[PDB]
């Protein structure tokens, strides 16, 4: 109970989170590269411009089904294509709030429908050498908040120093969002998507699936009845 009493006090006193730079797109650091592909490598889906909601959430779209974003100059549905979520950056409105046991969190200001694009997990894109250095620094300074998610081998998104609102989304063993790795313009991106209808005011969470680098020993405080005890 000793730690809880302190947490009650902290929640009262903590007016704002530590500063970070709010950015729109991933920022490669050092020798990290972002890759591109020729347009010939972007798939054309099965949607037609005459369909009710071409390439939409509820459509038959194979690109959406395989986690490929359509390209606007290529998609058979043309300007009616509803599968350009990462590039268009239309996110549901959200706000940061202070939790008791899980630091700062994020809650939605609007209703969100099952399958809707919620956010892109954006940050600095760093290599293993840089990740280890940052994790070691944090550990040496008793920092227990990590914002690192692997994109692929030797390319890690660190939303700590620079990121967007997705950096505030906490882990839950019964979450209402999930990460998905998509191919956008010939390279990988990490999106957050709603698992169910979510009501305005609700905290947005996802299952970290042990991907948050540095949290491998962390005890989960999500409070779900099916809690694994860890961030995954
Ligand atoms: C991506 S940040 C989420 C925002 C963070 N709570 C903050 O104050 O900035 C991930 C960190 O939040 C904490 N965290 C998130 N979910 C948690 C959970 N279910 N149980 C315990 N700590 C959690 C851990 O310290 C983790 O390293
Ligand atoms: Zn389509
Ligand atoms: Zn399309
Ligand atoms: Zn849990």
From Swiss-Prot:
Residues 92-209 form the SET domain. It is found in: Nucleus; Chromosome. Transcriptional intermediary factor capable of both negatively or positively influencing transcription, depending on the cellular context. It is linked to Sotos syndrome: An autosomal dominant, childhood overgrowth syndrome characterized by pre- and postnatal overgrowth, developmental delay, intellectual disability, advanced bone age, and abnormal craniofacial morphology including macrodolichocephaly with frontal bossing, frontoparietal sparseness of hair, apparent hypertelorism, downslanting palpebral fissures, and facial flushing. Common oral findings include: premature eruption of teeth; high, arched palate; pointed chin and, more rarely, prognathism. Expressed in the fetal/adult brain, kidney, skeletal muscle, spleen, and the thymus, and faintly in the lung. Residues 210-216 are annotated as: Inhibits enzyme activity in the absence of bound histone. Changing residue 155 to Q: In SOTOS; strongly reduced enzyme activity. It comes from Homo sapiens (Human). This is Histone-lysine N-methyltransferase, H3 lysine-36 specific. S-adenosyl-L-methionine binds at residues 102-104, 144-147, 170-171, 215, 221. Belongs to the class V-like SAM-binding methyltransferase superfamily. Interacts with the ligand-binding domains of RARA and THRA in the absence of ligand; in the presence of ligand the interaction is severely disrupted but some binding still occurs. Interacts with the ligand-binding domains of RXRA and ESRRA only in the presence of ligand. Interacts with ZNF496. Interacts with AR DNA- and ligand-binding domains. Residues 40-90 form the AWS domain. The chain holds residues 1852 to 2082 of 2696 of the full protein. Residues 216-232 form the Post-SET domain.
């Amino acid at each position: 109970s000793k730690e809880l009493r302190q947490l009650q006090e902290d929640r009262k006193n903590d007016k704002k989170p530590p500063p970070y730079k709010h950015i729109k797109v991933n920022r490669p650091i050092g020798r990290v590269q972002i890759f591109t592909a020729d347009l010939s490598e972007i798939p054309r889906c099965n949607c037609k411009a005459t369909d009710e909601n071409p390439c939409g959430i509820d459509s038959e779209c194979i690109n959406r089904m395989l986690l490929y974003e359509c390209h606007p100059t290529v998609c058979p549905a043309g300007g009616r294509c509803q599968n350009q979520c990462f590039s268009k950056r239309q996110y549901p409105e959200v706000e940061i709030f202070r939790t008791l046991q899980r630091g700062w969190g994020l809650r939605t200001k609007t209703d969100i429908k099952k399958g809707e694009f919620v956010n892109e997990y954006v940050g600095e894109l760093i290599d293993e050498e840089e990740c280890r250095a940052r994790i070691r620094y944090a550990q040496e300074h008793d920092i227990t908040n990590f914002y690192m998610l692997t994109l692929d081998k030797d390319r890690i998104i660190d939303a700590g120093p620079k990121g967007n609102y997705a950096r505030f989304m906490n882990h839950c063993c019964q979450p209402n969002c999930e990460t998905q790795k998509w191919s956008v313009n010939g390279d990988t991106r990490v999106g957050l998507f709603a698992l169910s209808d979510i009501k305005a005011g609700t905290e947005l969470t996802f299952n970290y699936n042990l991907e948050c680098l540095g949290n491998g020993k962390t005890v989960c405080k999500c409070g779900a009845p099916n809690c694994s005890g860890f961030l995954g």
